[PDB]
Design an enzyme around this catalytic site. Structure first.
Site, short mmCIF file in Angstrom:
data_model
loop_
_atom_site.label_atom_id
_atom_site.label_comp_id
_atom_site.label_asym_id
_atom_site.label_seq_id
_atom_site.Cartn_x
_atom_site.Cartn_y
_atom_site.Cartn_z
CE1 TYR A 160 26.78 -36.71 -7.58
CE2 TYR A 160 24.96 -35.32 -6.88
CZ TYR A 160 25.95 -35.63 -7.79
OH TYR A 160 26.10 -34.85 -8.92
CE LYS A 211 22.40 -35.78 -10.44
NZ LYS A 211 21.97 -34.40 -10.05
N1 LIG Z 1 26.35 -34.15 -11.87
C1 LIG Z 1 26.40 -32.97 -11.30
O1 LIG Z 1 27.26 -32.60 -10.52
C2 LIG Z 1 25.25 -31.99 -11.67
C3 LIG Z 1 24.23 -32.38 -12.56
N2 LIG Z 1 23.21 -31.43 -12.86
C4 LIG Z 1 22.16 -31.86 -13.78
O2 LIG Z 1 22.20 -31.11 -15.03
C5 LIG Z 1 20.87 -30.83 -15.49
C6 LIG Z 1 20.71 -29.32 -15.67
O3 LIG Z 1 20.70 -28.70 -14.37
P1 LIG Z 1 21.37 -27.26 -14.11
O4 LIG Z 1 22.49 -26.89 -15.00
O5 LIG Z 1 21.70 -27.14 -12.70
O6 LIG Z 1 20.16 -26.29 -14.31
P2 LIG Z 1 19.81 -24.97 -15.17
O7 LIG Z 1 18.42 -24.59 -14.79
O8 LIG Z 1 20.75 -23.91 -14.73
O9 LIG Z 1 19.84 -25.08 -16.72
C7 LIG Z 1 18.99 -25.95 -17.47
C8 LIG Z 1 19.32 -25.58 -18.92
O10 LIG Z 1 18.59 -26.37 -19.86
C9 LIG Z 1 17.88 -25.54 -20.80
N3 LIG Z 1 16.40 -25.61 -20.76
C10 LIG Z 1 15.56 -25.96 -21.80
N4 LIG Z 1 14.27 -25.91 -21.42
C11 LIG Z 1 14.31 -25.54 -20.16
C12 LIG Z 1 13.24 -25.34 -19.30
N5 LIG Z 1 11.99 -25.51 -19.71
N6 LIG Z 1 13.49 -24.94 -18.00
C13 LIG Z 1 14.76 -24.75 -17.57
N7 LIG Z 1 15.80 -24.95 -18.40
C14 LIG Z 1 15.60 -25.35 -19.71
C15 LIG Z 1 18.41 -24.13 -20.58
O11 LIG Z 1 19.48 -23.81 -21.47
P3 LIG Z 1 19.43 -22.75 -22.72
O12 LIG Z 1 19.12 -21.41 -22.04
O13 LIG Z 1 20.62 -22.55 -23.37
O14 LIG Z 1 18.17 -23.05 -23.61
C16 LIG Z 1 18.95 -24.11 -19.18
O15 LIG Z 1 20.08 -23.25 -19.02
C17 LIG Z 1 19.91 -31.43 -14.42
O16 LIG Z 1 19.36 -32.69 -14.89
C18 LIG Z 1 20.80 -31.64 -13.18
O17 LIG Z 1 20.36 -32.73 -12.36
C19 LIG Z 1 23.21 -30.11 -12.28
C20 LIG Z 1 24.22 -29.72 -11.39
C21 LIG Z 1 25.25 -30.68 -11.09
#
Ligand SMILES: NC(=O)C1=CN([C@@H]2O[C@H](COP(=O)(O)OP(=O)(O)OC[C@H]3O[C@@H](n4cnc5c(N)ncnc54)[C@H](OP(=O)(O)O)[C@@H]3O)[C@@H](O)[C@H]2O)C=CC1
Ligand SMILES: NC(=O)C1=CN([C@@H]2O[C@H](COP(=O)(O)OP(=O)(O)OC[C@H]3O[C@@H](n4cnc5c(N)ncnc54)[C@H](OP(=O)(O)O)[C@@H]3O)[C@@H](O)[C@H]2O)C=CC1
Ligand SMILES: NC(=O)C1=CN([C@@H]2O[C@H](COP(=O)(O)OP(=O)(O)OC[C@H]3O[C@@H](n4cnc5c(N)ncnc54)[C@H](OP(=O)(O)O)[C@@H]3O)[C@@H](O)[C@H]2O)C=CC1
Ligand SMILES: NC(=O)C1=CN([C@@H]2O[C@H](COP(=O)(O)OP(=O)(O)OC[C@H]3O[C@@H](n4cnc5c(N)ncnc54)[C@H](OP(=O)(O)O)[C@@H]3O)[C@@H](O)[C@H]2O)C=CC1
EC number: 1.1.99.28
Lengths: 381, 381, 381, 381
Positions: B217, B129
């Site tokens: 949330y 989400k």
């Molecule tokens: N339900 C919950 O409790 C939570 C849900 N989320 C959701 O998960 C998703 C990811 O967020 P989150 O882990 O916090 O964020 P991050 O920024 O830490 O990671 C995003 C990941 O996606 C990949 N990616 C590919 N293209 C891009 C780009 N252009 N810019 C940034 N990242 C890119 C990367 O992985 P790689 O390096 O391996 O290519 C990166 O590590 C979001 O939609 C967020 O809303 C986040 C926290 C909690």
């Protein structure tokens, strides 16, 4: 190893001892005399019983419309039966020099009336909240005080409640960091069968619904917790059209506010939901939760951070501060005795009335209402 | 008195014994294989670690744009190095039958396209989400799911968290009485130096500010606690104009809603204040306080009435239900195994996005937005 | 105002990104291999599941007397079926260099012999508490550890639990002042129908009743919270004579102690009442309340003073320290890797057993037992 | 939809109203008159201030050894200056018919003296705890009451405290299941500089250390919580020989008890550690935690089971029961008015004294002391 002097010198026989240590507020004198007008639910359950704990206040006279009841109470509190006024001869109090001030505990609409009336009787005025049902009536009340050169104080007990005071202190010490979001909720299920709730349903008598009644706490609270005034306001209200209780006054209403610091707040009041008195102040270091926030008793506050919840509440054996009620009464009493301004002046009660009217206007029009009118809290929150 | 049969029959020498009593979810099998897309903050801190407690799920492949990092993560979770994919060769997962589904944990603007490519690759899809950054894209994801005859699930962990399901159950059991007022708050201090937060400040990638990120949330929770949908929303948002963090997305926003039952709600999300996750549900019989309400851990609920506070939280020795992460993961797995719908389908994620767009629209115009568009929660809240 | 460099540099298309911020312990390697002995209640509910969060530990082999069960458990944890051992062919682990240590999770009377055979097999040993059922046997385990030049560690998870270490730290920081009174209670209703509890009712296998089983937490905790050893103990035990559960072992027993600092303590353990795990440490400045004190989860502590209650518990989104189980497991691993002593050595487990024998001896004779035998905690509490 | 009758009939002009609803104890009459002997710390901080809230009690006269102080108080509480007795002419009270009873708030050793003395003055006796410094003096006090055909009541406020009452009720309703382990702790750091604490250090004046002073609460509490009497007792005491405070009386002492039901209890009292008033009752269904357990204010109780903590405390707006102090005063007053036995008779105060002496004997000899002497709580706990 021998017993200390004090202990060893205590006679094993009946003997007099010195004044004991004070772990609680001790009565001192009873110089200030009050004239309580309106023997209602608050006057009898919280106010009159509150004098016992005062250090500077007494009940010299009571004003009632019900003579039989007024006679029963006078006995209980031992006030002079000859000092039982009524609404017709209320003005005659100006003849009693032992009546320093009056405490108005009448329906909202009747606040302005007896306030200016008492001011011309040369007495100090302690009016309950909300100040009045009109910004204008508030100003007229102020005018009477100035004209009579007397003291006008509103019944904001939270301004003299320990926990509420601790909450303000901790925020001023910056334990929450920069303030950005306040959340308030105040609710109680309206009972049309309760004589005290009946006038609250009448718009010309109450002036408004839950906001004027209890939502005012969140509003007022949001103000002294943040230590600043709203510059903008938005609101919305709704009530079940089929509920006979809300034909004239609003059941629940939600208002959002913005302050000069950039802080925001959202809060509500309700006549259809169970007991609720909860405030929340969010800074960028910690969050404060007041719950109960403004109860008559058992308040409880907590400063929260990940992994921590530091709670504060009145001790279990000691009483380092007097309860809000007594502290409120004596506060006016000692504000006169020392020729000092009162923390809860008519100008402060007038400020809530304006904001409330601005809020109703916002809920009515559905647009933002500018409240940046240069008000200034004389003497801090 | 003698010892019971069981105790008296235990050998005194080393001997095999029975399967023990289960006091926490035991592993069972790892039949459902996932391909995790985006090795970021949520993935490495919560999801990957969450597989251990799963009873039917396993990590089969990784999809990353940082080969060095993928290689490290793969080694940490015993993933076969040959199962590391690029964002360009992502589509080739269709060739691996051992990959039943993908879990999209990428920035919001990229959920749609990778969910669609996943479906074209004949795989089931779990997507974080907020579902996507446009209503249209949510529908395209749903259309692709149906076209491929595969399931679409949104990462709403709170739909599989023991304390949230317990709050929903006491509500449906009428323990609060008739619901009238719901209050929500979800906040966290935005730190532009955290890599994960960098795309969150870009409108194009995040699709919005604090509402899309964590205010959801409060929004989603208000819907499942009340067990109904809002018929209209109102809102206002503000962000300090000089703060480099909020040039494109909003910091603080407040939204209030009215539901067909008559219930109201006021909530807010913040990027400017510290950790807050608190929900209160006021009924006319009791009040529910969820605080922490949606934590990764330590959720705590309390039903409050004058003189009482009945709290509930996870036990100290037993674990009646699996943690939200493992549960969410197995939930999609059990849904395909048993041929059943999921509790958090694409339609559910799409509803939140439509409501959020309405809220932004209401803040932008300062007018209320009607959301009475007939969304029906399949399977209940 | 413009966006900061970080946010403005994020690509809008699919791109690799940096390692994220760690908000919980991340896996690192699985260099230290364990052989788990006894696939019972604690093993399958807590220890095996605890390996997932380890940063240096792994399960290499299983030792069971129930081949059918071992086969199932092995499959659940990816253990190589060829690594399943009998209690008779246990010694052959000496042939597998991939097995660095064993974790003995058998009934108390069998800890000693299998720890000794483990050392003869040239392996390190983790052994559950209580260490053994005789002081002599504890020494034989220690002698075998030294003879094999391998480490001996007792399963005191509370020595690696974040909330317990936090309680120890605030105490050493003199937040309670001079320690004077410690109170402990550890209880659980004994159910003879649970297979795990069956050997617990047999004196020969358990070595004792509630004190050996769970009273040891109060005993051990009193020692690390006070940070010193008792110089004498006193006690009394009672068990309903008609209750089939307590024919051989005690149900309820109370023990009080005096320490060289002058501090006192009174605690009790029970097989007759429900879940209790509560420690209070009274100083002359404040009082500490640990409740739950030694839970597998949800521990909670509070420092109390008139008007205050400062609580601490694990955060809701972050996990500063690893859980007690994973931590305990990695602790032995890091100790051999870095060539350092463990915090819970055989000497520590032996001290508790000697104290427990003194307590049973004090209850039996109704006389106080001097325990001023000079045990010194190596490395601190 | 129209306004209800009540609301619509409220005049918009000043008018009398009916007696308001009672959400708190209302004063009724003031027929019973008290003669308070001993103007100490308790008499002035808790007792006298307690009359204000009574419904049947008044302060008719006060007995003091310090004439100047006795004059200052008389003013504060408005008692007739001509009614200020002393220890010499205390007996003369028998001449005042308006003095129904006396309340002895003198050091322990002087309890028996003025009790029998007042009984011959034809007055009712309310003596503070501990009853007396000798089992014999207790019996003589009982004899005087019988001879004078008057009422003898001990100052056990916990017998009239809401929360303490709720605790007993819930246990009688079997919410804890079968009772098996009680734990009590009562502590306060002794200050030799406090005039009230000086006689407590004198053995012939106090009769004992912390046990006679505050440990009595745990003892008494253990008794009415369990609803039965001890049949056996064991104890141990210790005090720092270098501390000048405990040359004659014990600092801390720990006592273990057994009951006919098979229930056990362990508790302690302390003069060297900070504020502590905590009771714990363990059944086989739930555990009750009273903390604060016996405070002057802010008591809090909780029934705990895995995953649950149901807390109870005084409400925040209502007061369904009178505070322990007032309730205690009126209790004697109305026990006379209705010719009914008192819940806290001299026989109950005498029972604690015996048990305490039995406890001291146990701590002195280090052996079990049989207390199965057929005592019976007349009128239940
Ligand atoms: N339900 C919950 O409790 C939570 C849900 N989320 C959701 O998960 C998703 C990811 O967020 P989150 O882990 O916090 O964020 P991050 O920024 O830490 O990671 C995003 C990941 O996606 C990949 N990616 C590919 N293209 C891009 C780009 N252009 N810019 C940034 N990242 C890119 C990367 O992985 P790689 O390096 O391996 O290519 C990166 O590590 C979001 O939609 C967020 O809303 C986040 C926290 C909690
Ligand atoms: N700060 C706080 O915590 C609280 C403040 N209040 C405030 O106190 C004031 C009194 O309200 P409350 O005591 O609750 O209500 P009640 O209805 O119980 O009492 C109102 C009193 O005013 C007198 N009165 C005069 N004219 C009227 C009239 N036309 N209709 C009804 N009463 C009349 C009556 O006195 P008599 O019968 O003797 O003639 C009556 O006792 C309000 O302004 C309210 O906002 C109330 C509760 C708490
Ligand atoms: N620190 C903590 O929190 C806890 C520590 N423990 C400790 O762990 C140890 C094991 O206890 P627990 O898991 O509860 O108990 P269980 O009875 O459930 O299991 C004991 C296991 O050891 C093996 N075993 C070998 N011979 C015997 C025998 N003769 N009788 C019974 N079992 C035998 C069996 O495994 P297999 O079938 O595979 O042969 C059995 O499953 C104890 O010393 C206990 O004190 C227990 C709970 C918590
Ligand atoms: N149930 C409860 O919660 C409490 C009960 N108590 C009980 O009340 C009683 C009084 O103790 P407390 O008020 O704390 O103590 P204080 O020392 O403060 O007062 C004792 C009082 O008794 C009179 N007195 C007569 N002879 C002596 C003497 N020889 N030495 C000292 N005082 C004497 C004095 O009255 P005057 O100076 O006016 O002549 C004095 O005010 C005790 O029995 C105590 O156990 C105390 C606190 C709480």
């Amino acid at each position: 190893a021998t017993l200390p002097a004090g202990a060893s010198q205590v006679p094993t026989t009946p003997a007099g001892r010195p004044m004991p240590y004070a772990i609680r507020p001790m009565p001192e004198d009873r110089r200030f005399g009050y004239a309580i007008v309106g023997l209602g639910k608050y006057a009898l359950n919280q106010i009159l019983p509150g004098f016992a704990g005062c250090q500077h206040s007494r009940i010299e006279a009571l004003v009632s419309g019900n003579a039989e009841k007024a006679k029963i109470v006078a006995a209980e509190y031992g006030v002079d039966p000859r000092k039982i006024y009524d609404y017709s001869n209320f003005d005659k109090i100006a003849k009693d020099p032992k009546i320093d001030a009056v405490y108005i505990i009448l329906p909202n609409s009747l606040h302005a009336e007896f306030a200016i009336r008492a001011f011309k009787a040369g007495k100090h005025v302690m009016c309950e909240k909300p100040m009045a049902t009109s910004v204008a009536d508030c100003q007229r009340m102020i005018d009477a005080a100035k004209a009579a050169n007397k003291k006008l104080m509103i019944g904001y007990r939270c301004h003299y409640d320990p926990m509420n005071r601790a909450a303000v202190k901790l925020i001023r010490e910056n334990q929450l960091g920069k303030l950005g979001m306040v959340t308030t909720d105040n609710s109680d299920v309206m009972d049309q069968n309760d004589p005290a709730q009946q006038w609250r349903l009448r718009r010309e008598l109450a002036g408004g619904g839950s906001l004027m009644d209890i939502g005012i706490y969140g509003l007022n609270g949001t103000r002294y917790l943040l230590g600043e005034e709203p510059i903008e306001v938005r609101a919305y209200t709704y009530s079940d059209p089929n509920d006979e209780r809300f034909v004239e006054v609003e059941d629940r209403i939600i208002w959002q506010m913005r302050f000069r610091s950039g802080a925001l707040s959202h809060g509500a009041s309700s006549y259809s939901t169970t007991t609720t008195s909860r405030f929340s102040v969010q800074g960028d270091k910690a969050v404060l939760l007041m719950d109960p926030a403004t109860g008559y008793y058992q308040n409880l506050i907590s400063v929260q951070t990940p992994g921590h919840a530091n709670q504060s509440m009145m001790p279990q054996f000691i009483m380092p501060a007097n309860n809000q009620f007594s502290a409120q009464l004596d506060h006016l009493a000692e504000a006169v005795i020392n020729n000092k301004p009162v923390r809860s002046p008519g100008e402060e009660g007038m400020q809530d009335v304006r904001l409330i009217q601005a809020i109703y206007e916002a809920a009515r029009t559905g647009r933002p209402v500018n409240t940046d009118w240069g008000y200034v809290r004389q003497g801090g929150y």
